[PDB]
């Protein structure tokens, strides 16, 4: 399971099971460019969010109903969609993953 392997390798489920996480299959530079595209509001109402002009390759990792510490288990779902990142700093880069439409 790609999700079970990647959540672990990346230190997300080494000490706990995280319910959901999204992985983006694009170059780092292309995702950082989003912070300069379509400005939109973030869920929390803040407006330092941006939506990608085009869809990107991503896979959603979602914990199943029968997942519990030590043995976290995920359902893997590949898709192409517009990402939304919240941005911050200088260089203005992504600090959070707010969504994917």
């Amino acid at each position: 399971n790609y999700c079970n392997q990647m959540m672990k390798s990346r230190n997300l489920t080494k000490d706990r099971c995280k319910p959901v996480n999204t992985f983006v299959h694009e170059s780092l530079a292309d995702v950082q460019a989003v912070c300069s595209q379509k400005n939109v509001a973030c869920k929390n109402g803040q407006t330092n969010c941006y939506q990608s002009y085009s869809t990107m390759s991503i896979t959603d990792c979602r914990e199943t109903g029968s997942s519990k510490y030590p043995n976290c288990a995920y359902k893997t779902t590949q898709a192409n969609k517009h990402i939304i990142v919240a941005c911050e700093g200088n260089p203005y880069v992504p600090v959070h993953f707010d969504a994917s439409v």
């Binding site: 983006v24 299959h25 780092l28 700093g89």
Partner: peptide, 15 residues
Amino acid sequence: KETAAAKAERQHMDS
């Protein structure tokens, strides 16, 4: 220690 941008890349980038 880990910044917010480095953390974001580690948790979400799989170039």
